[PDB]
Amino acid sequence: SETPLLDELEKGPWPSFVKEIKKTAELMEKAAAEGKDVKMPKGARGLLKQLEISYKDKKTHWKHGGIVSVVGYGGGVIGRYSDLGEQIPEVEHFHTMRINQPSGWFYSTKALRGLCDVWEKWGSGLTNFHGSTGDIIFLGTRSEYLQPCFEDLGNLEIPFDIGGSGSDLRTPSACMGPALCEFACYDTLELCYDLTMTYQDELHRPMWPYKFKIKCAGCPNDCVASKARSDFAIIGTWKDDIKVDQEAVKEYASWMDIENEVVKLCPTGAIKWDGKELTIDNRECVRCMHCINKMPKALKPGDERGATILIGGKAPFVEGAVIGWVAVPFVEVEKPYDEIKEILEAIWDWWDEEGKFRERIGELIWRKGMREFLKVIGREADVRMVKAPRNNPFMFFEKDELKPSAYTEELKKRGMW
Amino acid sequence: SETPLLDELEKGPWPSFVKEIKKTAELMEKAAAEGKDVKMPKGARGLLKQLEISYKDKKTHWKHGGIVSVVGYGGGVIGRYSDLGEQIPEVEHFHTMRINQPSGWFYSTKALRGLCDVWEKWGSGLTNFHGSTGDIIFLGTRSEYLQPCFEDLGNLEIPFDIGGSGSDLRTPSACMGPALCEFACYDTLELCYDLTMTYQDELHRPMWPYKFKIKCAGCPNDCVASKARSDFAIIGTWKDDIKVDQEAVKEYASWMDIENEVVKLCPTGAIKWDGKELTIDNRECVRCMHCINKMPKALKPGDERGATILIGGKAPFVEGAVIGWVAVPFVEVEKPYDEIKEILEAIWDWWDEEGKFRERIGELIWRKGMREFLKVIGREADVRMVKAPRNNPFMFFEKDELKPSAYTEELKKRGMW
Amino acid sequence: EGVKTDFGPPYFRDLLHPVIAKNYGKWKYHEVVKPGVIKRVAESGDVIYVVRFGTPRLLSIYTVRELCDIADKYSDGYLRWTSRNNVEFFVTDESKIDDLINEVQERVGFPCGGTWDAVKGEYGLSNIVHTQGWIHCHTPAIDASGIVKAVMDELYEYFTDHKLPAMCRISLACCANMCGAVHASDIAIVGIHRTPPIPNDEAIRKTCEIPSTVAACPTGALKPDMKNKTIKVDVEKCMYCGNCYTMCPGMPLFDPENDGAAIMVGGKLSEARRMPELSKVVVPWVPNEPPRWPTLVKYVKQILEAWAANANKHERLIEWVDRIGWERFFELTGLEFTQHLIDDYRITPYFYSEFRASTQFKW
Amino acid sequence: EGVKTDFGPPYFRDLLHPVIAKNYGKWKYHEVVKPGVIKRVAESGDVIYVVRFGTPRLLSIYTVRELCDIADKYSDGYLRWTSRNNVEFFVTDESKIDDLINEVQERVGFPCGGTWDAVKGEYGLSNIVHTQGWIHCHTPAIDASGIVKAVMDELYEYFTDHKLPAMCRISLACCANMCGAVHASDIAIVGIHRTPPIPNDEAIRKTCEIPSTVAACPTGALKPDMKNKTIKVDVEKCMYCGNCYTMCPGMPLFDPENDGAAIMVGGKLSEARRMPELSKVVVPWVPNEPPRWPTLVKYVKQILEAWAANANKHERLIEWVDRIGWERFFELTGLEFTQHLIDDYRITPYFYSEFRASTQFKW
Ligand code: SRM
Ligand code: SRM
Ligand code: SRM
Ligand code: SRM
Ligand code: SF4
Ligand code: SF4
Ligand code: SF4
Ligand code: SF4
Ligand code: SF4
Ligand code: SF4
Ligand code: SF4
Ligand code: SF4
């Protein structure tokens, strides 16, 4: 065998990525042998060979990449080079193209066959469905193929644009929401598409101190992991009462241990069941979703719908990993989403002016303070922004909050204050 | 009136500090008028006058003090000077002497009359029972009286030494413990006295990077607030079963709502009551004291007694206020307390070698890490030291834990590693 | 010969009442008889009654002498103070208790009480732990003695009777380095400045070691100015902690019109029911209004009465909040949440939040 | 003509299945048929069956074409992927439900499953979210696709059933840069280095943005040597994150023998029952063992099966821990607490612990 280590991973019940690579290699080589226009027939086999050596060595064989892009864009293509250049020349250049997904990864066969045809012609035949951010990954191509691949994507009957990379607005993503989910508090897919479209320039042409990510979740269940994986997490919610179908609850009560599986599990004890009537103190409810999750036929999100915005979510780098925290307790999500757009724009202006090289929004807020951040987005401080008031008396006071005094005059006179 | 603002504070039911000051003034002046040997008859009146002006101005009238002490000691006396020197000369110098208390602030009348006699002769007549650390405060004397006051304290039938101040071991303190308390897990008063005496030099002659505080609590109720107000908090505990008198529980059960006031209030749900038998799962108990606090006639601390040591407790300055955290889950408290003394000594050696100017032990541990600290005290890492494992993968590995490799050889060859 | 040194405090065992010395470490149980009065029953059968009185802490030696006469008359010449500066007497003859209580009241004016009974779940308010304020300290933002008196006058009824459903500790600190355990108390009053320091270059040169003054600033707001051999302050970063003035006379930041107190809430030290916690700010600031501090007093009282009216038996302030959340806490207390109350204290490491700051753990 | 730009991805609404398009935002209730199969009901009174399959993420376009061939005569030409790299199908006529599951198994070898029903309370395992490893990435310590395959082999049956008390998510990251939901997953595998970086002075002067390489070190182990013109590394302060290599090709901290993975545990995203949580390291290091990573797989199973055994219905891992404590967690999982598990990452601020990292609050 040419690949004894990777062959081990063709064994076992779970579908094999090695099989995916080999299948690509065989059929790309066959396609080129039949005279089909395929520029990179050996790309997938080259990848396999490199990966086998990497399994033998227990290390990567990719080096720091030179910076590359398609004409007019500064992002969406990642340069990647193999330190096994001479030995495996077919993967010396092996770049990734990030392709913007439809909202909620919904496809038709026609849309997908288009992508398959372009990538077969110009790339390795290897893809990721999907990249962690949400993009379709075109895994492995040369520099001179990037532009004509892009031209073809744009000319498809169902055309696909490049996603984001570098210091830009990344490709937004969204949960299925109102497509399949009865929990939906807003149209996630529509919001996602609208933002992607409104801020095409921000996405294609990186201009910021670092990357910025937006993700849209239909309800608190947070099915796109927005609060950990996006800088700006838009999570559906409501303001009024949970709707309760009483007869439906009774149907559940005949078989479900509602006391133990629902009542006792509510973080705030807002939900009660006596055998006849279900009761919810919506003043005490924190919209955690559990009770609704438990009884979808009986329980529903209220009518006054919108989103809570969580700011700061990120991976560790520099200052520590972040689950986003409350920036805006409630905002309406209605086309054309002017309220959400005003927030974003204000944040970007400020971040571009004040941010350091490679400083994420979360780190900027930590450095500049919540006060500055709130006045930037033009919002008031709210107790719902904290799990608890500060545990120390070390407060900043603004000049205008101080009583006039001989001392304040002294500060004024010195030129400080 | 000479003091119209302070007079307001002679009104109201709560006993008045102003009355305390005026009483002192009148009777010190009277004592000096009868020819008694009183060096500072006007000290208390001078304090009153200054305090009135301070009430009028809403600011302090004390300035940064010069450094002063008694012969042979570098600590226990705080220099304090008034910026109202020429106007009120009797408080120009007004120093504080910290006098070491008996363990648990137990006194006899003879002991106290001794103190009152010395302070009457040499000081203002003003005292604090007690200073927050535990010491008796001799509030207000001149520089030339410090030494002869100390000589007299030492010559008393029941003699009193100076406590700590500056960068030293401060006067240790302890809760009443077994003197009065049936909850006591060790002899707090004895341990307190023993440390005070073992480390007289450390206390009288500051030699460390900053101050260091020890406090002894006989049980988790922590009636001396050791975990917040001492660097080294010695808190009584046990290892075996809570002792349960079943018939005494039944006596309680006739009038006490045990289900609601005890069972449901245990943090871990280790205690159950069925109407006949009380049960405690001591594997699940965390010795929080509530159930025992609730039923002292029925429930007692186990027989295998000792202390948990909490390290770091301090006020905010520099890096933040600290409730001490677990350094030693369990140590025996048996005269002559060699195990506890070894821990202290190891810590002090390390802290004196590695500490920065004005760095507290808590801050040092934060800067050097728990690993270094544990090897200093020669203890192993324990899950009971954390509320949770670290939320990030950024771990230091020691040289000896690494597998030998070409790379480790490279580090060795460069001179790093 | 020489002056004696290094001899320490008098050994406490020489100073215990005979009955306490005899029964040391041999107690059966205690019973809170009435406010101020605790009965302790020994395994021997001895019964002693520990009677407690509030005090202003600052004592006249003439008051100590008076307390001593009373001690000789009712407790065989033995007394103690507590760790919150109340005073206690030991009475063997139960028929003599009320004589002592009334004689203390008549002679020194100290109220019997300051106790609590976990057994029936009824609690008094004990003394307020406090530091020196303007009586003796050079770095205070507020005055300790005055505020304590002013708040105890208003809350007096709570010291003399068991009127509250759980423990409530009120502690005062006259500046931010919070001498005392004010930072871990149910209701903490903490003095603060709101104005940055004005470098006095002459005083700094003469009296301040620059590098350590610079290093004392938690926010990095001080930089050395080698040229004029002094310190420069970046006011954008100063949060008026006062630390640099602790280190350096040439860095005063007092403003008598903007100095004042913050009110913090929800500290716990005991392990009972739930873990210890540090206090949290709920009122950013109230001015110094000597001699009665009415604005400060009113908010303390407002907070106490709100918790007292809603707390279940045993539920200390933080346990109350545990149940109802901060949204309702600010509502029920009639307090405003403002941006001031969002922690921006950057130097404190996140990792300390992951350390077990408590003796609650399983074996 | 030129080349057209700024047009974006296709409008999703045109890529919707008729019934899904019609009943948009107008659904009544969902019902999990079996494992892999969710029935969906709309106000109108129309029924569609979502059918979910596990995918290796990395896909041949020929596997995609074959997914399309399936999609036509089963789901009217439409399909989706999920946030966890699973391919869903939309089936109408439901006699035909089961040979679908088969032809997929026959053609692409993707197994139906990855679902859960909260209602009864029976959860199965879903796909592992991950990155590139040695397939495409230049900073990795471990290999995603490989470890995923190995773990998912030992954890197949779970994914194909609802053999679980509660919901459990597993995630993988190839380095400390941590791509995916690894910082907040019930179980997480994170590529770590245990070895400092040896400076390559030879290429640091030609490439590498020097002062920004120095600025991008979290512990400050890097000092910009100016002589000489290179970067010198204080090994005392390096915790081997690998971030300096992301910034500079002349900082390889790669030691194949010492690079491995940590296992972290108890992260939550959903708000249900309890607030979301970041994951915690419980196994410091397991070795890189191509091809089957036994030691890694062993510890993942050990942990998964221990919680599985003991957890109540809906009791996720962090929830379990809330109940038993970490003391009992390590005992039950057979893992050893070492000093490595005590946090020492200085730069993160304490005040983040006070921020509401969650939608759970009251109006
Ligand atoms: C006299 C004194 C000890 C001393 O050496 O001076 C003391 C004595 C007792 N404490 Fe305490 N505690 C004393 C300060 C404290 C303080 C420390 C402080 O406030 O600075 C607290 C810690 C405060 C905190 O948690 O924030 C303290 C927390 C407790 C606990 C906790 C109650 C709770 O629900 O959290 C118990 C429980 C109880 O109520 O029985 C307790 C109970 C007791 C018991 C009942 C123990 C016993 O078995 O006899 C003692 C009788 C007190 C009573 O009134 O019922 N003691 N106790 C203390 C002096 C205080 C005073 O004059 O008012
Ligand atoms: C298909 C998918 C939506 C999508 O747009 O892709 C999805 C769909 C649903 N999720 Fe989810 N969740 C999906 C990702 C998630 C993930 C996000 C992730 O793992 O990256 C979790 C958050 C994980 C976390 O909390 O750490 C997620 C948290 C939930 C919650 C949480 C359950 C809990 O006890 O915490 C609900 C509750 C439930 O079980 O009904 C939920 C329930 C649902 C419901 C039942 C909503 C509904 O009313 O129909 C959907 C049916 C799924 C099912 O299996 O029962 N879904 N949802 C998701 C893709 C995952 C997959 O292929 O397996
Ligand atoms: C006398 C006493 C107040 C009282 O009336 O009770 C006191 C008074 C002073 N304290 Fe303190 N502290 C007193 C107990 C405390 C305690 C509590 C304790 O010891 O139980 C603490 C908190 C625990 C701690 O130390 O962290 C305390 C924390 C401080 C701070 C904080 C240092 C820090 O690391 O954050 C300052 C600053 C300093 O160290 O220079 C300080 C400094 C001072 C200074 C020297 C004022 C200053 O800023 O330089 C004090 C001057 C009072 C005077 O001149 O009359 N004092 N101080 C307390 C001691 C009497 C006694 O010995 O019994
Ligand atoms: C190191 C850095 C930032 C940088 O450019 O130096 C980074 C670089 C990168 C970029 C570098 C670049 O921008 O050229 C690459 C190269 C790796 C590197 O460390 O340099 C990369 C591969 C991916 C890939 C695979 C693409 C491929 O084929 O390589 C994906 C998946 C995808 O394409 O959607 C991906 C999606 C994330 N990548 Fe990524 N990625 C980082 C995190 C992330 C995640 C976790 C975002 C986050 O912070 O939450 C992403 C996953 C969640 C999400 O939904 O966005 C990340 C650290 C964030 C921070 O500030 O701490 N990164 N990230
Ligand atoms: S986040 Fe809410 S609306 Fe979106 S798929 Fe999940 S449960 Fe449905
Ligand atoms: S949504 Fe959550 S907090 Fe609200 S009643 Fe239901 S289970 Fe309770
Ligand atoms: S700490 Fe414990 S032993 Fe000491 S007085 Fe308090 S309850 Fe008694
Ligand atoms: S000591 Fe505390 S945890 Fe233990 S049984 Fe009593 S109340 Fe419960
Ligand atoms: S709290 Fe502040 S003002 Fe009060 S005595 Fe201590 S240092 Fe001085
Ligand atoms: S008052 Fe505090 S923040 Fe301001 S300069 Fe001084 S130490 Fe720094
Ligand atoms: S950044 Fe880390 S997790 Fe992401 S692809 Fe690179 S090595 Fe893998
Ligand atoms: S590996 Fe991380 S800690 Fe070490 S020098 Fe590089 S950036 Fe700094």
UniProtKB/Swiss-Prot annotation, chains A, B:
Cofactor, how bound (note): Binds 2 [4Fe-4S] clusters per subunit.
Annotated compartments: Membrane
Pfam families assigned to the protein according to its UniProt record, in alphabetical order: NIR_SIR, NIR_SIR_ferr
Domain 4Fe-4S ferredoxin-type positions: 276-304
Residues reported in the UniProt entry to bind [4Fe-4S] cluster 1: 175, 181, 219, 223
Annotated GO CC locations: membrane; sulfite reductase complex (NADPH)
Function statement: Catalyzes the reduction of sulfite to sulfide. This is the terminal oxidation reaction in sulfate respiration.
Keyword terms of this UniProt record: 4Fe-4S, Heme, Iron, Iron-sulfur, Membrane, Metal-binding, Oxidoreductase
Subunit structure: Heterotetramer of two alpha and two beta subunits.
Catalytic activity: [DsrC protein]-trisulfide + NAD(+) + 3 H2O = [DsrC protein]-dithiol + sulfite + NADH + 3 H(+)
Protein name in UniProt: Sulfite reductase, dissimilatory-type subunit alpha
InterPro entries: 4Fe4S_Fe-S-bd (IPR017896), DsrA (IPR011806), NiRdtase/SiRdtase_haem-b_fer (IPR005117), Nit/Sulf_reduc_fer-like_dom_sf (IPR036136), NO2/SO3_Rdtase_4Fe4S_dom (IPR006067), NO2/SO3_Rdtase_4Fe4S_prot (IPR045169), NO2/SO3_Rdtase_4Fe4S_sf (IPR045854)
Temperature behavior of the protein's activity: Highly thermostable. Inactive towards methylviologen below 55 degrees Celsius.
Keyword Oxidoreductase attributed: yes
GO terms of molecular function: 4 iron, 4 sulfur cluster binding; dissimilatory sulfite reductase (NADH) activity; heme binding; metal ion binding; sulfite reductase (ferredoxin) activity; sulfite reductase activity
EC number: 1.8.1.22
Highest taxon in the source lineage: Archaea
Record-listed [4Fe-4S] cluster 2 binding positions: 266, 285, 288, 291
Cofactor(s) annotated in UniProt: [4Fe-4S] cluster; siroheme
UniProt entry tagged with the keyword Heme: yes
Ligand binding (siroheme): 223
GO BP term, pick one: sulfate assimilation
Curated annotation (Swiss-Prot), chains C, D:
GO function term, MF aspect, one: sulfite reductase activity
Cofactor remark: Binds 2 [4Fe-4S] cluster per subunit. Binds 1 siroheme per subunit.
Residues annotated for [4Fe-4S] cluster 1 binding in this entry: 137, 174-175, 179
Enzyme Commission number(s) from the entry: 1.8.1.22
Binding site for [4Fe-4S] cluster 2: 217, 238, 241, 244
Amino acids binding siroheme: 179
Quaternary structure and interacting proteins, as annotated: Heterotetramer of two alpha and two beta subunits.
PANTHER family from the UniProt entry: SULFITE REDUCTASE [NADPH] SUBUNIT BETA, SULFITE REDUCTASE [NADPH] SUBUNIT BETA-RELATED
This protein's name: Sulfite reductase, dissimilatory-type subunit beta
Organism: Archaeoglobus fulgidus (strain ATCC 49558 / DSM 4304 / JCM 9628 / NBRC 100126 / VC-16)
Gene: dsrB
